[PDB]
Amino acid sequence: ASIRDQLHTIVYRYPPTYVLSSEEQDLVWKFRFYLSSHKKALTKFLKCINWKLEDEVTQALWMLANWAPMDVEDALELLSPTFTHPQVRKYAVSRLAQAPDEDLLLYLLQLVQALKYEDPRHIVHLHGCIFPANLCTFLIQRACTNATLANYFYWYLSIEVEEKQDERAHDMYAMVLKMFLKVLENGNFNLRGIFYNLRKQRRFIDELVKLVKLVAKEPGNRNKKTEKFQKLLAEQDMFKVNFTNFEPIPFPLDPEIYITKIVPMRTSLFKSALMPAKLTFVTSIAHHEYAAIFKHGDDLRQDQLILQMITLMDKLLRRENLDLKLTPYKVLATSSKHGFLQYVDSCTVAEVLAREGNIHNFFRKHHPCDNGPYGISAEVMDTYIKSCAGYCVITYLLGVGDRHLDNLLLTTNGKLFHIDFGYILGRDPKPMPPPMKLSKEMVEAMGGISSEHHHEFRKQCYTAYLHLRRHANVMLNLFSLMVDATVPDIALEPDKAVKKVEENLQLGLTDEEAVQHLQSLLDVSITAVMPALVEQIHRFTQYWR
Amino acid sequence: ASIRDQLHTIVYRYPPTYVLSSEEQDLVWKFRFYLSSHKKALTKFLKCINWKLEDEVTQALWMLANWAPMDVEDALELLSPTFTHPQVRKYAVSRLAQAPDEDLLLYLLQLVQALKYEDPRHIVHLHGCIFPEANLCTFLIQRACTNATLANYFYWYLSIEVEKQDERAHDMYAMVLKMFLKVLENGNFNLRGIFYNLRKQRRFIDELVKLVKLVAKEPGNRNKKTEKFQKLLAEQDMFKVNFTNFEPIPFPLDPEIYITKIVPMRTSLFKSALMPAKLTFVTSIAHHEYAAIFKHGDDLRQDQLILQMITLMDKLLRRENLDLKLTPYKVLATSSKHGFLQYVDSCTVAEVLAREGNIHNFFRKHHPCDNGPYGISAEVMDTYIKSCAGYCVITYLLGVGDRHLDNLLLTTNGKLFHIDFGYILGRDPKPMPPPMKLSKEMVEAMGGISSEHHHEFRKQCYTAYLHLRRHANVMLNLFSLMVDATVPDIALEPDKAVKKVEENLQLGLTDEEAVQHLQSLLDVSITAVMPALVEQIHRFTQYWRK
Ligand SMILES: CC(=O)/N=c1/[nH]c(C)c(-c2ccc(Cl)c(S(=O)(=O)NCCO)c2)s1
Ligand SMILES: CC(=O)/N=c1/[nH]c(C)c(-c2ccc(Cl)c(S(=O)(=O)NCCO)c2)s1
Incomplete structure (x- = not known):
């Protein structure tokens, strides 16, 4: 028939969250052998078979290996907590590896959440190997290849590691981060390099935070507080890092750009109630300033999720040739309770x-x-x-x-x-x-x-x-x-x-x-x-x- | 051919009247001549060429004469004041000739209007033809005489028109009515029959007009006016026409139905300040009763146009098979300031x-x-x-x-x-x-x-x-x-x-x-x-x- 082809089209090429497919799935099965039209179809097929039969699983596993290769997004669905099976999880990871670094970065945030769903024993074993494939090994291997990835991966893990179920995931994320730092410390020259850079970023933030806390303790209206802020930055070696000059640090917000100094005078504080500074920096190249904001008291994880979302939608629309001149500005969190944000004039x-x-x-x-x-x-x-x-x-x-x-x-x-x-x-x-x-x-x-x-x-x-x-x-x-x-x-x-x-x-x-x-x-x-x-x-x- | 076709097909289907694309009109020509396949194209075609000079005009008539025949609607468009030319009006009327009587019945209001559009010479020649001293007015007349219902409506539309450039149009209308009536009298038996019926109708209408004038006269309250009204109906010889019984007349508002008499006890009167009357009539057959309203205040030319439009739209919808179950009650104006309305419960x-x-x-x-x-x-x-x-x-x-x-x-x-x-x-x-x-x-x-x-x-x-x-x-x-x-x-x-x-x-x-x-x-x-x-x-x- 032809009608059959169309009812199927609605099912394989329409909604992903739907557990909707019910028995039709059994019908899907028959055509499945003859034609796996597409990748979209593979994701749909996977949903119906697994739990009940071991022999049915063997046929499906062979079917998946043969299957026309899935697109990355579907890979995310696989990494979801809904699919228990190790082989599908492995397949999902293989799909990710094949994807280019920039696309891999956009998702990265989810990959960290995905880490929770990947079986704990893989992670305990990996730890066992490092001290006296699976995705977490994959994320670390990939994180090491590229400095910017190393950087976001480090920042996401650290946000998770600070203080019921919180205990199980925290221990596990903590395990992951310790492993990552240890891989870098040993790794080679480029990996050692990544490790030093992070060490530097960590140190810089801590001092930046210290200075910010001093500003808050000092009483005054915003202006009196801001003048005080300008003074502290200019104060040399009150702090572990000197703010007027330092050794160049890849910006945590943006890994691509080093910074040098901060300009005390160009720093303002914001009108908003929780007061965040603009800062300026110079940069390693040609002295160009950068600014970002820095925020004293809020968890930005929410803001970063929404911005990732806006960035993603913008990317999709743009390929379709729709530019709505959206500005997605970079956020990161540091700790919960501080982060940066890109500044747009x-x-x-x-x-x-x-x-x-x-x-x-x-x-x-x-x-x-x-x-x-x-x-x-x-x-x-x-x-x-x-x-x-x-x-x-x-x-x-x-x-x-x-x-x-x-x-x-x-x-x-x-x-x-x-x-x-x-x-x-x-x-x-x-x-x-x-x-x-x-x-x-x-x-x-x-x-x-x-x-x-x-x-x-x-x-x-x-x-x-x-x-x-x-x-x-x-x-x-x-x-x-x-x-x-x-x-x-x-x-x-x-x-x-x-x-x-x-x-x-x-x-x-x-x-x-x-x-x-x-x-x-x-x-x-x-x-x-x-x-x-x-x-x-x-x-x-x-x-x- | 390939891409030029879509723009052609859009222009023939999409606009009802277009100034636009005067260059486009001249562009269509080259491919117009050849396609010449479908009629709706013809309508757009005629539009462009006539502003354009004369020698092409004769060529266009050969094009016109040959072109696939129009549906009736496009022709109402050609009877338009917009196109002056005489040969097209013959074409449009030939198109009308083709229409089954019911369609002509629907477009009648508009056709009487089309009379306002020249030529007066056509009316005067026909007048000179029947007096001491096909083509549009003739068509309408010949058509009216063919069928009685058609004739009725034609009479009442003419009737109202005659009752600084408006006066000359009025005068023209007047000639057309007198001709139409004289054709009927000189008629073979059926025409004479239609004519006699029209006379019956009028005599009747005027007796009822008088009666209403007498009921209106009284200062007494509405309830007192209904009572007076009933009494005027119950006494014969009061009027040349007696209302409790008369020789069957085809109802003027609906030609098909014949009426013997109004029933007086059932008559009621309406709330509005200008005060409409509801009348029950007895049909000629099977003691069916039909209710109508007769209104003494204003000309219903507006109300009747709307109902025509509603009826039209209904028919279109139901032809696409959408009974939206509208109720288009019949309206006829006798004159400015008296009318009849189908009453619906x-x-x-x-x-x-x-x-x-x-x-x-x-x-x-x-x-x-x-x-x-x-x-x-x-x-x-x-x-x-x-x-x-x-x-x-x-x-x-x-x-x-x-x-x-x-x-x-x-x-x-x-x-x-x-x-x-x-x-x-x-x-x-x-x-x-x-x-x-x-x-x-x-x-x-x-x-x-x-x-x-x-x-x-x-x-x-x-x-x-x-x-x-x-x-x-x-x-x-x-x-x-x-x-x-x-x-x-x-x-x-x-x-x-x-x-x-x-x-x-x-x-x-x-x-x-x-x-x-x-x-x-x-x-x-x-x-x-x-x-x-x-x-x-x-x-x-x-x-x-x-
Ligand atoms: C003049 C000016 O405000 N330039 C800016 N460009 C951007 C991206 C700014 C920004 C972005 C995020 C946040 Cl969280 C803030 S905020 O001022 O720190 N919070 C505002 C709550 O109503 C400010 S502010
Ligand atoms: C009102 C009722 O019970 N039945 C009716 N069915 C129809 C078609 C009615 C009708 C049609 C047209 C007009 Cl003009 C009127 S009317 O009542 O005479 N005018 C309203 C205020 O002055 C009534 S009234």
């Missing part, structure tokens, strides 16, 4: 309005074109619309709550981005989120409800939503892996978190239905936002008396 | 809501089923949903205004329909009309926005819309012929009227987009109507403030 939307009446005035000031469209250079408008679309959709998919003018920022080229992703998957302090988050001023920024640009924005949202809908599996698989993740919003209900993103993605609906649905959310949110729209609705209510 | 919603707290109760009273989706039988519920769907869509395209709960009535059966059309094409006494018209109570009748019936209802509107979009052209041509019509609402911005319906049609949108647009309109209308949805909006507005 921007003005907070609230600052822009306070300081320039409206967004347009501010853009116009930076990029005047007499000729169009708002007396603002066309490209800036374009980037602003695109950033807006990218963010509504991503904020919506990732269920990001708690946005405000302090929260959004702008750039001088136009882009908008978000910040401070403390509320995730629809947690909001408030009782009633709008489903889509657009400030009145942002809508006005587009020249109101009826403008060419507003239409461009909605068109753009639908397209972006549709593309993400298509590339579901990867995000769902990364979330599947973040169940026991120690990200607070996920921690409230582990299970519901994966389900929530799936619900937002709206995979059930047909494409025409999904666009209509999205349109509906945008519309309620925008009507609520505009006052003219609200008075007009009152008028319609009134019309029936 | 109905309870106004406002009435239904006082009589019953809710619409569900009402429906439940008339068709219970314990297993029913609600207390109600499933068929009633489905029909109600459909009727709503049809009516929102139609109201939206038509920019019908003034809807209130007295304006829309409900049948025991469940069909919902709107009755009154004072305000049209977005004219509304009120300043900000909802784009879609739903009573809050109508939505509740669907079981609310989460309820599935509501979802089905919405699905129904979208498809109704999609289909109607497809037969865009027939409506457009009709309205283009109604430009000089004398409906008050067209008259204020007569040129702009057609454009207003065209905006409602959103022809520019692709189908997915169209639906989206309509969805937006539904949404606003419903949210305004529901107090819970406004509350939600209210909390949302609260979010950004602080």
Whole structure:
């Protein structure tokens, strides 16, 4: 038949979390031998057979080895806690190895979570071998090959190692890190090198933290505190590291860039309540400054997960040839309670309005074109619309709550981005989120409800939503892996978190239905936002008396 | 060939009238000549060439004469004021000749309008032909005499037109009626029969007009006026025509039915200030009784156009097989300020809501089923949903205004329909009309926005819309012929009227987009109507403030 081919298509090439496939799976089995169309199919096949029969397992194992090779994302699904079997786990690891380093890095965070699911005895044995294949051996081998990987891997392990089930995973992660440092210490010249560099980073942060704690103890309003901060950095050999000069250190935030000194005067502290510094650094090359922020008191693991998410979505959209000019900025955590964040030069939307009446005035000031469209250079408008679309959709998919003018920022080229992703998957302090988050001023920024640009924005949202809908599996698989993740919003209900993103993605609906649905959310949110729209609705209510 | 075809196929199918692509028109020519396969192409083809000079015009007629024959609708487009040329009008009329009588019956209003479009010389020649001293007017006459129902309608449309460039058009209309009547008198027996029938009808109408004038005269309250009315009916010789019995006349509002007499005891009178009367008539056969309304206040030319449009749309939908179970009651205007309306048994919603707290109760009273989706039988519920769907869509395209709960009535059966059309094409006494018209109570009748019936209802509107979009052209041509019509609402911005319906049609949108647009309109209308949805909006507005 031909109908048969299509019912199968819905099943192998639609949803990954679905345990849905039920008996149809048995039907899948028959075609399975004749045609394993694709990799997507392999992931689906694996789900149905395993537990019941040893002989059935033998046939499946042979089937998997023969099978057309799976794509990496599916590999993540395999590393998931759902699949117990060692051979499938090994196969999943083989898939990862084949993948290029940069892609391997993007996932890395999940791979560390994945570590929890890999059997403990592999890890105890490996330890046994080092003191008086399996994935953890794989992560260490790969981590050693590449310095940047070594660096993130080290930072992720260390975040886990500091102070019920916490005990089992902590001992195990601790085991992993000790092994990693010991492999580097022995390794050769390049590995020894990696080890020294980390030693340096660790030392630098500790002193940086010490200085920060002194600043907090010292009393004053922010400015008095900041002046004090400037003074400490300039103070030579109060600290183990001298902040005005040091030996070059690959930035922990970015491993690629060494730093030299810090400039005491260029350091500010932020308006936000928990006060984080901007710092500047010089860099090893040509003296170029870098800045990052550094944050005194918060666990950023949540922020890093969301940013990875935004980075990933952006990568996917870009291959599709959609650039929404999203800015994913680097975060890392250090310890829980400190990290860095990349600094983007921007003005907070609230600052822009306070300081320039409206967004347009501010853009116009930076990029005047007499000729169009708002007396603002066309490209800036374009980037602003695109950033807006990218963010509504991503904020919506990732269920990001708690946005405000302090929260959004702008750039001088136009882009908008978000910040401070403390509320995730629809947690909001408030009782009633709008489903889509657009400030009145942002809508006005587009020249109101009826403008060419507003239409461009909605068109753009639908397209972006549709593309993400298509590339579901990867995000769902990364979330599947973040169940026991120690990200607070996920921690409230582990299970519901994966389900929530799936619900937002709206995979059930047909494409025409999904666009209509999205349109509906945008519309309620925008009507609520505009006052003219609200008075007009009152008028319609009134019309029936 | 390959890529040039798609743009061809788009232009023939997609726009109803286009200024655009004048260079495109000249581009089509080269490949127009050759394809010449399908008729809808022909319509677009004629448009370009005539502004273009004369020697190509004669070539185009050979092209025209040969081209695959048009469907009737495209021809109403050619009778347009837009195309002046005489040979095409022959072609258009030959096209009309082909139409079965029922189709001509539908387009009649528009055809009488098409008379306003020249040539006067055609009328005067025919006048000179029957007086002391095929082609359009002749066609209409010859056609009218062929069939009696056709003749009736033709008479009443002519009749109303005759009762600084308007006077000359009036005068022309007058000649056409007198000719039509003289043809009937000189007629073989059947014509004479039709003629005698028309006379009977008028004599009758005028006696009833007098009677109404006498009932209107009294200062006494409405209840006192009904009583007076009944008495005027019960006494014969009061009028040249006696109302308690007369020789069977074919009902003027519906030609087929014959009426013996009005029944006086059953006569009732309506609430509106200008005070309409409801009359029961006796049919000639089997003592069937037919109810009608006769209205003394205003010309129903507006109301009748709308009902034509509704009937038209219904037919299209049902031809795509969408019984949205509309109820297009018949309307005829006798003259400006008197009319007849098919009465259909109905309870106004406002009435239904006082009589019953809710619409569900009402429906439940008339068709219970314990297993029913609600207390109600499933068929009633489905029909109600459909009727709503049809009516929102139609109201939206038509920019019908003034809807209130007295304006829309409900049948025991469940069909919902709107009755009154004072305000049209977005004219509304009120300043900000909802784009879609739903009573809050109508939505509740669907079981609310989460309820599935509501979802089905919405699905129904979208498809109704999609289909109607497809037969865009027939409506457009009709309205283009109604430009000089004398409906008050067209008259204020007569040129702009057609454009207003065209905006409602959103022809520019692709189908997915169209639906989206309509969805937006539904949404606003419903949210305004529901107090819970406004509350939600209210909390949302609260979010950004602080
Ligand atoms: C002027 C300016 O604020 N430039 C910045 N570019 C970026 C990426 C900033 C940033 C990123 C993350 C965080 Cl967590 C912060 S924060 O100011 O430390 N917390 C804000 C809570 O409302 C600030 S701030
Ligand atoms: C109201 C009722 O019970 N049955 C009816 N069925 C029909 C088609 C009605 C109708 C149609 C057109 C008009 Cl114009 C009217 S009307 O009641 O005469 N005009 C309303 C306010 O002045 C009533 S009324």
